[PDB]
Amino acid sequence: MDEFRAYDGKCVLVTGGAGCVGSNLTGNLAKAGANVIILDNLSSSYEWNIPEYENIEFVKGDILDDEVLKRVFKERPDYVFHLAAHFANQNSVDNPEKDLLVNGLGILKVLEYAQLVGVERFVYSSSGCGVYGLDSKIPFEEHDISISLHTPYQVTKLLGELYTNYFHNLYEMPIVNARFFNVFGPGEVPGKYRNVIPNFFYWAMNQQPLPITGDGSETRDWTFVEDIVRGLMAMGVRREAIGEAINLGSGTEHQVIEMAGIINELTENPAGVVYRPRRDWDAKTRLLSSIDKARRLLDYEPQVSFREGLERTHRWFTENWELIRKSAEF
Amino acid sequence: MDEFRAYDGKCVLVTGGAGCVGSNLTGNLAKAGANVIILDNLSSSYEWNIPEYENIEFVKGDILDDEVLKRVFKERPDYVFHLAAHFANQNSVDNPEKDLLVNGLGILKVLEYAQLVGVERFVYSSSGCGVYGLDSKIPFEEHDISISLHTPYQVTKLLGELYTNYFHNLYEMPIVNARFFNVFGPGEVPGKYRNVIPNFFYWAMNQQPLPITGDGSETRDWTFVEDIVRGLMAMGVRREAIGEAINLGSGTEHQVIEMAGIINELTENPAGVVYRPRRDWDAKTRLLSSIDKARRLLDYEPQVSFREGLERTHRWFTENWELIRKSAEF
Ligand SMILES: O=c1ccn([C@@H]2O[C@H](COP(=O)(O)OP(=O)(O)O)[C@@H](O)[C@H]2O)c(=O)[nH]1
Ligand SMILES: O=c1ccn([C@@H]2O[C@H](COP(=O)(O)OP(=O)(O)O)[C@@H](O)[C@H]2O)c(=O)[nH]1
Ligand SMILES: Nc1ncnc2c1ncn2[C@@H]1O[C@H](COP(=O)(O)O)[C@@H](O)[C@H]1O
Ligand SMILES: Nc1ncnc2c1ncn2[C@@H]1O[C@H](COP(=O)(O)O)[C@@H](O)[C@H]1O
Ligand SMILES: [Cl-]
Ligand SMILES: [Cl-]
Ligand SMILES: [Cl-]
Ligand SMILES: [Cl-]
């Protein structure tokens, strides 16, 4: 609160700033007095998702385009939050080159420009799916990484860390690698390549059965977007985060069948659940992070329960239902 | 010997097959009866470097070009040795995007085509510089990797492993990741971005002082090219190599000043040595691999001593001196 007043009067660039995390993040930066610039190509998000503040400048463009990168970086951002990404697992399996260009060459370009102007922090949204392998012990600790991965998204999420660490090591760029665990909340529009919670909300609110890809006992560590954002904002300002990879998760597990049940309950869906095979790239029956490093370095602590998070997500759906129906990416 | 007769009558694609490793490798495959196809854009090598055998087809082209990839992959290779790379540390620091396209997108394309036709083995030339970090214990063991790297080449060398493991994990591609340690021998032309041994030969044979970037006590594990090739050829056929990363090195250390001394002695250079600062990306005062996994899995054993290797390298230089002078990349 008093912490985040280091953003007041600062120029902050959020690539991917119109998505779920970005929209919530830009809103909070704007409240803290930052002059926020969003760069987003609207490939998975919509302009309507951006919160309306005088001190948010929205720039439609691509991180692969050197023209628009010069346009935003000539503003000389003090902070870059790099949230632009080709999302996610299936999308990357389907389109692995595109995935590499966006997540590999895209971050590299953004880093190169960041080096040219100098930044106080470069905070990259990495992934807990992209680094903890079948041999990593649950709950996942940041040192315990694998290079044996199951999708090109996992590959390129780790690649982004390879690049931020490089720029830290050779050029002393103050980077932070935030390993997000299954983010959910207001601001993720549903669609073919999107996450399960918004799709389950969307299907349940059309009274369709929720398709479970597995037996339902698979777990995730679902982290509410507002928790993620408080994590990110601490990462921008705490010296101790510099050069570190840090999990941002809830630190608790929930079963897919529980999550489906809550969503059916909240939406008064009568159609229940149907079972489908496990997706072939999905080797993870469990994901669970250890958030002790984030507590230590950032005084991070999740504040929003799984249930409260689902309820908030539901409210977002009901309040923007027709817009979500127009916008859904199936 | 009896081992390598599994290559007889087989189609083998060697990307980067005109370089130092590739030229030596293609020659040996040709002797074993393989129908060898080289794909090489001649960016750091020359056509004169390719050994003359009836059963080597040379295709000038780039791994980034989908047309030429269709041309070679329609031959349906049983084996791919992927040696095409953007080389190396300084080159990558200077040209990091180019580096990513060649080492990241290039390997990804080659892997995608390999998946389309099916291969018996996909052997990738990774690097011992690209994966063992400042915290990795010497002698370097294959599990003991870092994601904190010092050049984009190191980054993209590891990226190639990320991709081969992916294709192994999702699509059961029989891959092998060969982590080469400072290769040297006949077939590396000297130049601005090239390795120290050929440049030291070139400078010494022009009676110029050998520039040492450091104090001279820094060590490498220099591995003679013919040893590397015997490693690669075992990797193509041994079931036990499938899915593995395996160091190919000498397993011994030599100081830079020793190496300079030998080269000055061999070339009768009178100009001695001069000292220059450590290159800023070069955090490695020592590199030394553990080759116990290669012994175990491939019955690999270096046969050529450092000294014998330097003498052979020298012979190559004297025998092709004028061609090397025309060809040098400074
Ligand atoms: O339509 C779907 C999509 C996902 N899942 C399950 O929900 C969890 C999270 O899936 P998501 O695609 O949101 O994230 P990821 O698998 O990438 O963590 C996984 O255990 C899936 O098996 C599901 O049951 N039905
Ligand atoms: O012109 C040079 C180039 C390299 N080296 C040294 O020789 C070793 C190997 O350098 P090279 O560039 O061949 O390989 P790498 O550093 O990538 O292992 C290193 O310890 C360098 O400091 C040197 O003394 N002079
Ligand atoms: N190449 C790109 N350039 C700029 N923005 C992008 C690019 N790719 C994806 N995005 C955006 O980045 C955000 C990523 O959020 P998500 O889709 O949750 O991963 C979305 O708002 C996308 O529209
Ligand atoms: N993009 C590329 N496509 C095809 N061959 C390449 C490419 N980049 C480099 N090469 C070749 O790959 C070999 C790599 O050997 P080296 O230069 O020792 O790393 C050389 O013969 C190069 O000419
Ligand atoms: Cl592992
Ligand atoms: Cl601080
Ligand atoms: Cl490390
Ligand atoms: Cl065997």
Side-chain angles (χ1 to χ4, degrees), chain B residues 238-262:
Chain B
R238 301 288 276 250
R239 292 233 94 219
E240 315 99 274
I242 290 168
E244 295 295 343
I246 302 172
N247 297 336
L248 291 183
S250 78
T252 66
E253 265 179 304
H254 294 273
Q255 292 178 256
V256 167
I257 192 52
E258 191 198 346
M259 176 273 299
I262 295 159

mmCIF file of all heavy atoms in Angstrom, chain B residues 238-262:
data_model
loop_
_atom_site.group_PDB
_atom_site.id
_atom_site.type_symbol
_atom_site.label_atom_id
_atom_site.label_comp_id
_atom_site.label_asym_id
_atom_site.label_seq_id
_atom_site.Cartn_x
_atom_site.Cartn_y
_atom_site.Cartn_z
ATOM 1 N N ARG B 238 22.971 -47.007 -30.744
ATOM 2 C CA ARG B 238 22.751 -47.600 -29.402
ATOM 3 C C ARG B 238 21.386 -47.221 -28.825
ATOM 4 O O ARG B 238 21.166 -46.059 -28.599
ATOM 5 C CB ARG B 238 23.857 -47.185 -28.431
ATOM 6 C CG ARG B 238 25.255 -47.583 -28.861
ATOM 7 C CD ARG B 238 25.527 -49.066 -28.753
ATOM 8 N NE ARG B 238 25.927 -49.346 -27.398
ATOM 9 C CZ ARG B 238 27.138 -49.689 -27.004
ATOM 10 N NH1 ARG B 238 28.111 -49.860 -27.874
ATOM 11 N NH2 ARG B 238 27.361 -49.890 -25.726
ATOM 12 N N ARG B 239 20.532 -48.210 -28.582
ATOM 13 C CA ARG B 239 19.206 -48.009 -27.976
ATOM 14 C C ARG B 239 19.263 -47.213 -26.690
ATOM 15 O O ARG B 239 18.364 -46.444 -26.388
ATOM 16 C CB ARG B 239 18.507 -49.348 -27.640
ATOM 17 C CG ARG B 239 18.074 -50.217 -28.829
ATOM 18 C CD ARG B 239 16.592 -50.622 -28.761
ATOM 19 N NE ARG B 239 15.770 -49.673 -29.539
ATOM 20 C CZ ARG B 239 14.554 -49.207 -29.217
ATOM 21 N NH1 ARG B 239 13.919 -49.573 -28.098
ATOM 22 N NH2 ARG B 239 13.958 -48.342 -30.041
ATOM 23 N N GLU B 240 20.325 -47.435 -25.927
ATOM 24 C CA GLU B 240 20.480 -46.862 -24.590
ATOM 25 C C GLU B 240 20.682 -45.342 -24.607
ATOM 26 O O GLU B 240 20.458 -44.688 -23.600
ATOM 27 C CB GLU B 240 21.675 -47.486 -23.852
ATOM 28 C CG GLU B 240 21.796 -49.010 -23.927
ATOM 29 C CD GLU B 240 22.803 -49.499 -24.978
ATOM 30 O OE1 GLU B 240 22.423 -49.654 -26.168
ATOM 31 O OE2 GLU B 240 23.975 -49.715 -24.603
ATOM 32 N N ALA B 241 21.138 -44.797 -25.731
ATOM 33 C CA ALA B 241 21.267 -43.346 -25.875
ATOM 34 C C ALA B 241 19.918 -42.610 -26.064
ATOM 35 O O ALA B 241 19.866 -41.397 -25.895
ATOM 36 C CB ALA B 241 22.199 -43.033 -27.039
ATOM 37 N N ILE B 242 18.856 -43.337 -26.434
ATOM 38 C CA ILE B 242 17.574 -42.730 -26.799
ATOM 39 C C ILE B 242 17.016 -41.932 -25.646
ATOM 40 O O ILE B 242 16.879 -42.434 -24.531
ATOM 41 C CB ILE B 242 16.527 -43.769 -27.250
ATOM 42 C CG1 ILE B 242 16.912 -44.349 -28.600
ATOM 43 C CG2 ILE B 242 15.142 -43.139 -27.398
ATOM 44 C CD1 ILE B 242 16.114 -45.583 -28.986
ATOM 45 N N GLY B 243 16.684 -40.681 -25.921
ATOM 46 C CA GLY B 243 16.098 -39.796 -24.908
ATOM 47 C C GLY B 243 17.097 -39.198 -23.948
ATOM 48 O O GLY B 243 16.710 -38.472 -23.061
ATOM 49 N N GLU B 244 18.382 -39.498 -24.102
ATOM 50 C CA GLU B 244 19.398 -39.064 -23.151
ATOM 51 C C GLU B 244 20.186 -37.822 -23.613
ATOM 52 O O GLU B 244 20.440 -37.642 -24.806
ATOM 53 C CB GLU B 244 20.427 -40.207 -22.975
ATOM 54 C CG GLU B 244 19.888 -41.478 -22.347
ATOM 55 C CD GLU B 244 19.437 -41.277 -20.909
ATOM 56 O OE1 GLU B 244 19.801 -40.281 -20.278
ATOM 57 O OE2 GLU B 244 18.676 -42.098 -20.410
ATOM 58 N N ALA B 245 20.614 -37.013 -22.662
ATOM 59 C CA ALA B 245 21.727 -36.098 -22.871
ATOM 60 C C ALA B 245 23.026 -36.784 -22.423
ATOM 61 O O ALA B 245 23.046 -37.409 -21.370
ATOM 62 C CB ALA B 245 21.542 -34.837 -22.077
ATOM 63 N N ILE B 246 24.084 -36.656 -23.230
ATOM 64 C CA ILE B 246 25.352 -37.346 -23.021
ATOM 65 C C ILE B 246 26.496 -36.410 -23.406
ATOM 66 O O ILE B 246 26.576 -35.986 -24.550
ATOM 67 C CB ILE B 246 25.436 -38.601 -23.926
ATOM 68 C CG1 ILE B 246 24.259 -39.553 -23.654
ATOM 69 C CG2 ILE B 246 26.802 -39.289 -23.805
ATOM 70 C CD1 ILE B 246 24.169 -40.714 -24.629
ATOM 71 N N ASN B 247 27.378 -36.102 -22.461
ATOM 72 C CA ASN B 247 28.595 -35.356 -22.737
ATOM 73 C C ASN B 247 29.512 -36.142 -23.668
ATOM 74 O O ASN B 247 29.698 -37.358 -23.504
ATOM 75 C CB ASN B 247 29.392 -35.106 -21.481
ATOM 76 C CG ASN B 247 28.672 -34.252 -20.467
ATOM 77 O OD1 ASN B 247 27.785 -33.479 -20.797
ATOM 78 N ND2 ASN B 247 29.071 -34.381 -19.215
ATOM 79 N N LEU B 248 30.039 -35.453 -24.675
ATOM 80 C CA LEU B 248 31.117 -35.967 -25.470
ATOM 81 C C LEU B 248 32.268 -34.994 -25.268
ATOM 82 O O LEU B 248 32.239 -33.880 -25.796
ATOM 83 C CB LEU B 248 30.725 -36.069 -26.938
ATOM 84 C CG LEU B 248 29.682 -37.116 -27.332
ATOM 85 C CD1 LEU B 248 29.523 -37.079 -28.832
ATOM 86 C CD2 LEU B 248 30.040 -38.531 -26.886
ATOM 87 N N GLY B 249 33.254 -35.419 -24.480
ATOM 88 C CA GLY B 249 34.468 -34.630 -24.197
ATOM 89 C C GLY B 249 35.703 -35.535 -24.119
ATOM 90 O O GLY B 249 35.605 -36.752 -24.351
ATOM 91 N N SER B 250 36.855 -34.953 -23.797
ATOM 92 C CA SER B 250 38.066 -35.750 -23.523
ATOM 93 C C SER B 250 38.097 -36.175 -22.050
ATOM 94 O O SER B 250 38.688 -37.169 -21.705
ATOM 95 C CB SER B 250 39.326 -34.965 -23.878
ATOM 96 O OG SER B 250 39.600 -34.017 -22.848
ATOM 97 N N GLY B 251 37.447 -35.420 -21.181
ATOM 98 C CA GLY B 251 37.492 -35.700 -19.754
ATOM 99 C C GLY B 251 38.784 -35.256 -19.084
ATOM 100 O O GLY B 251 39.036 -35.632 -17.954
ATOM 101 N N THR B 252 39.571 -34.427 -19.764
ATOM 102 C CA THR B 252 40.790 -33.849 -19.235
ATOM 103 C C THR B 252 40.796 -32.354 -19.515
ATOM 104 O O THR B 252 40.161 -31.886 -20.452
ATOM 105 C CB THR B 252 42.055 -34.462 -19.901
ATOM 106 O OG1 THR B 252 42.096 -34.114 -21.302
ATOM 107 C CG2 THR B 252 42.069 -35.990 -19.746
ATOM 108 N N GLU B 253 41.571 -31.630 -18.730
ATOM 109 C CA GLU B 253 41.663 -30.182 -18.779
ATOM 110 C C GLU B 253 42.997 -29.808 -19.316
ATOM 111 O O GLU B 253 43.985 -30.433 -18.952
ATOM 112 C CB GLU B 253 41.661 -29.605 -17.368
ATOM 113 C CG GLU B 253 40.327 -29.170 -16.879
ATOM 114 C CD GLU B 253 40.421 -28.633 -15.480
ATOM 115 O OE1 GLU B 253 40.906 -29.350 -14.598
ATOM 116 O OE2 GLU B 253 39.985 -27.496 -15.268
ATOM 117 N N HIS B 254 43.046 -28.729 -20.087
ATOM 118 C CA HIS B 254 44.308 -28.093 -20.413
ATOM 119 C C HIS B 254 44.197 -26.612 -20.293
ATOM 120 O O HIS B 254 43.183 -26.034 -20.642
ATOM 121 C CB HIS B 254 44.774 -28.455 -21.806
ATOM 122 C CG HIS B 254 45.111 -29.888 -21.946
ATOM 123 N ND1 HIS B 254 46.361 -30.398 -21.646
ATOM 124 C CD2 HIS B 254 44.353 -30.936 -22.321
ATOM 125 C CE1 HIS B 254 46.359 -31.701 -21.856
ATOM 126 N NE2 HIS B 254 45.147 -32.053 -22.253
ATOM 127 N N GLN B 255 45.285 -26.002 -19.840
ATOM 128 C CA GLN B 255 45.375 -24.571 -19.734
ATOM 129 C C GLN B 255 45.564 -23.912 -21.103
ATOM 130 O O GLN B 255 46.255 -24.429 -21.974
ATOM 131 C CB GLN B 255 46.531 -24.178 -18.816
ATOM 132 C CG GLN B 255 46.331 -24.527 -17.355
ATOM 133 C CD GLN B 255 47.565 -24.145 -16.540
ATOM 134 O OE1 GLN B 255 48.343 -25.006 -16.167
ATOM 135 N NE2 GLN B 255 47.787 -22.868 -16.345
ATOM 136 N N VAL B 256 44.978 -22.743 -21.261
ATOM 137 C CA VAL B 256 45.119 -21.979 -22.469
ATOM 138 C C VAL B 256 46.609 -21.729 -22.802
ATOM 139 O O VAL B 256 47.014 -21.881 -23.966
ATOM 140 C CB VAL B 256 44.337 -20.658 -22.367
ATOM 141 C CG1 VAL B 256 44.711 -19.689 -23.489
ATOM 142 C CG2 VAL B 256 42.829 -20.938 -22.408
ATOM 143 N N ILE B 257 47.408 -21.362 -21.794
ATOM 144 C CA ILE B 257 48.857 -21.099 -22.021
ATOM 145 C C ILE B 257 49.618 -22.330 -22.533
ATOM 146 O O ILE B 257 50.535 -22.218 -23.349
ATOM 147 C CB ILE B 257 49.552 -20.497 -20.770
ATOM 148 C CG1 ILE B 257 50.965 -19.961 -21.100
ATOM 149 C CG2 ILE B 257 49.574 -21.507 -19.604
ATOM 150 C CD1 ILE B 257 51.058 -18.987 -22.275
ATOM 151 N N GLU B 258 49.217 -23.507 -22.091
ATOM 152 C CA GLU B 258 49.814 -24.740 -22.622
ATOM 153 C C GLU B 258 49.478 -24.897 -24.107
ATOM 154 O O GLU B 258 50.350 -25.128 -24.944
ATOM 155 C CB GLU B 258 49.330 -25.963 -21.850
ATOM 156 C CG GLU B 258 50.136 -27.202 -22.206
ATOM 157 C CD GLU B 258 49.472 -28.489 -21.827
ATOM 158 O OE1 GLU B 258 48.501 -28.449 -21.049
ATOM 159 O OE2 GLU B 258 49.922 -29.548 -22.328
ATOM 160 N N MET B 259 48.197 -24.758 -24.405
ATOM 161 C CA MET B 259 47.710 -24.850 -25.763
ATOM 162 C C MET B 259 48.420 -23.839 -26.669
ATOM 163 O O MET B 259 48.900 -24.223 -27.749
ATOM 164 C CB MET B 259 46.183 -24.691 -25.779
ATOM 165 C CG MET B 259 45.535 -24.661 -27.153
ATOM 166 S SD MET B 259 45.486 -23.010 -27.856
ATOM 167 C CE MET B 259 44.491 -22.138 -26.649
ATOM 168 N N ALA B 260 48.508 -22.576 -26.232
ATOM 169 C CA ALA B 260 49.275 -21.556 -26.991
ATOM 170 C C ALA B 260 50.746 -21.974 -27.231
ATOM 171 O O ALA B 260 51.276 -21.820 -28.329
ATOM 172 C CB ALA B 260 49.223 -20.205 -26.293
ATOM 173 N N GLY B 261 51.371 -22.528 -26.195
ATOM 174 C CA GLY B 261 52.757 -22.952 -26.256
ATOM 175 C C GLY B 261 52.959 -24.052 -27.252
ATOM 176 O O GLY B 261 53.896 -23.997 -28.057
ATOM 177 N N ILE B 262 52.075 -25.049 -27.233
ATOM 178 C CA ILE B 262 52.203 -26.127 -28.187
ATOM 179 C C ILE B 262 52.082 -25.601 -29.614
ATOM 180 O O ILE B 262 52.896 -25.929 -30.488
ATOM 181 C CB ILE B 262 51.219 -27.272 -27.911
ATOM 182 C CG1 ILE B 262 51.560 -27.939 -26.563
ATOM 183 C CG2 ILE B 262 51.275 -28.295 -29.041
ATOM 184 C CD1 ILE B 262 50.411 -28.710 -25.971
#
